[PDB]
Amino acid sequence: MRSVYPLARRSMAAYTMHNMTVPEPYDYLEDPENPETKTFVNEQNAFFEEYFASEAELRKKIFESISNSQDYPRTSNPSYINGHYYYYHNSGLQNQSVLMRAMSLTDTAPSIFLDPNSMSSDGTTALKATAWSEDESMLAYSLSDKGSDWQRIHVRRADTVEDTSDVIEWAKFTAIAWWHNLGFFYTRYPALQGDVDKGAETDAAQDAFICFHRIGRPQDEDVVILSVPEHPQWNMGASVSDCHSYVIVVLFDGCEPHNLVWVAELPSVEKGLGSEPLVFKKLVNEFAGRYTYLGNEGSTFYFVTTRDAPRKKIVSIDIHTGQETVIVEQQRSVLSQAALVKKTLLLAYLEDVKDVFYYCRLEDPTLNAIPLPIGTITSFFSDRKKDFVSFKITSFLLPGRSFFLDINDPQSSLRVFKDDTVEGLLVDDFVTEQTFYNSSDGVRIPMFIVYRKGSVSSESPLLLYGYGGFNIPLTPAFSSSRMVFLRDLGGVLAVLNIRGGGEYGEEWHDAGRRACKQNCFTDFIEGAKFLHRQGYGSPQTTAIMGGSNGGLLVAAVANQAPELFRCVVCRVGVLDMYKFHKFTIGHAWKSDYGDPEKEEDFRVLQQYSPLHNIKSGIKYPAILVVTGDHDDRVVPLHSLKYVATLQHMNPNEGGPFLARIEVAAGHGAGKPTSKILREAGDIYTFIAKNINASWKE
């Protein structure tokens, strides 16, 4: 039977919130440094290993398989700068990608340009952002250490290939924007105090500002550019115009996709940098949508906006007079990407969760379609004055294709640059398909199903995945672990585009936000049940999984119909809605989650609260949560807090309940290859063990 679970401490503390007393027997989970939390972590992982030793040999086996399936050169898009082509590349097992600088597109011997590999001994360092100078003799990159979101900016000059002594500290969400050959604009957070480990505190983000630092001088001469006293809680970012005359600042309230944008002039006087504060024209100052900037032509200013257009729309707004005129009206599709070069505008549309590429000149805005194989655009490089464009397109079948193009006439210039081919894999062994199934709304929802052609039955192992949050659509994308699942385990993968995502744009998220948030979970239920009525899945042979908010989905749907699932995993997921507003950047999450002060919002929040909604005496599936000690993007405590209830809530019925907390790890952005590979291997061994899906030889 199930072994004796670790003796969890029970805390008497109970707090009253909106005239409702919530007890909390695990408050000591706030501080990771407490002895109780550390001993509980150690015991939980010891029992995890004891459970897993039953099929540790299969663990090693599929570890070997995933390692052999991960070994391929991952080449990204080329960048054309100063007659040299810089593109990311990996040997396949090296911890981080390294830049390649080639003299030509067809060059055989490109040299290394940027190498994060030797930065840290364990390779924990991850490159986060980069930016270019207009004279192509300067670039500024920004990385992070120990998986902590707190970053560090370094600067390098191309020709000498040497570092510089300038470094910056405690920076988050870095947006470098250089101005001619003098300096660059960035954002910086208030100075931290104490001896706490970097990125190892729960303090909420506040009192940050954007500023500008010039080269040749220390950080001490940095002059504050913009800081808002009226709204301390908002986030904001800066951007330099390619016309080299104006600076654009964008302000978001929380994480919800509305912003107000301010345009300012720039003085050519060197002393003016630090002489007087810069004025700000009130271009848009009310939250009507996300008014992203694309490019400007003199007085004219082109933006992709959601105002008066739920599916995104390209509009030209003159800032010297204040008139607004629409130039590219919204089609029935949703804009995934857009850019403006010379006279043409090239737009990638996420139509039916498929990117179709269109180009339209300023004369006739007819979006003319340029052929491109089915897939999903991941990265996109573009420069207004340049004549070379490139993008990587990948999906479930395609492991990645770097494709370049000429803006002047794509009619005969679309060419293949590189392919991320993986040995021992064939396209014909698998096939994907779209499906439409009706939810309670009476409106069809799309879903993707990828499966190996041939043997597929209702009892075959099923994995179902869907994120659906923050207006990020779960577009098709390759995964080595997914391919190991597909080919080595003979199962079928399915991806849900649930309501509330950007899969249909702003209206979809608007319908799936705040008061109707619970609605999305109901949809997920139908998803799995539909796969059982179509003949693709059986309740004893299904597993669903997701990350962060998607991980949320899993646990919360387990509260609705636990017996409708059998295998469930959580991964750095938000679970403690009662206190999610307090710690980390969760305050921005309120803009998508309901502000807990508002009573009508706390009604639904307490309705679906997965930390407390779990009930005893009812069967539950086996949850496996994964966390890391240095998790600042999401506070790790919430996840363990979830397990904290189950330990006492189900003595020997349901589960089993696994918590894998890995020492010295990240969040998911910049994970070292060894650690992420080991974690994926363990996750898939667990889902195979609790599904009984033998080796598909």
Numbering used by the authors: 1 to 697
Study text:
Amidst these challenges, a member of the endopeptidase enzyme family, T. cruzi 80 kDa prolyl-oligopeptidase (TcPOP, enzyme ID EC 3.4.21.26), has been identified as a potential vaccine target for Chagas disease. It degrades collagen and fibronectin extracellular matrix components on host cells, facilitating parasite invasion. Our cryo-EM data confirm that TcPOP comprises two distinct domains: a catalytic α/β-hydrolase domain, which houses the active site featuring the catalytic triad, and a β-propeller domain, which likely regulates substrate access. The spatial arrangement of these domains reveals a cylindrical structure, with the β-propeller domain capping the catalytic α/β-hydrolase domain, as previously postulated.
Here we report the three-dimensional structure of TcPOP in open and closed conformation, at a global resolution of 3.8 and 3.6 Å, respectively, determined using single-particle cryo-electron microscopy. The initial data collection, comprised of 20,080 micrographs, revealed severe preferential orientation, resulting in poor map reconstructions. We therefore tilted the grids to 30° and 35° to increase the number of views visualised in the electron micrographs. This significantly improved the number of views, and the resulting map was drastically improved with continuous density and minimal anisotropic features. 3D classification revealed two distinct conformations of TcPOP i.e., open and closed, indicating intrinsic conformational heterogeneity of the dataset. Two conformations of TcPOP could be easily identified in 3D classification, spanning from fully closed to fully open with an overall motion of ~22° between the two domains. The evident stability of the α/β hydrolase domain observed in both open and closed conformations, as well as in those from aligned cryo-EM maps, suggests possible regions that are exposed to the immune system when the enzyme is secreted in the blood, and therefore likely to include potential epitopes. Our data show that TcPOP clearly fluctuates between open and closed states independently from the presence of the substrate, confirming that the observed open and closed conformations occur in solution and are observed without the usage of any additive. Taken together, our HDX-MS data corroborate with the existence of the TcPOP open and closed conformations that could be resolved in cryo-EM, and with the presence of intermediate conformations that arise from the switching of selected helices and loops at different rates.
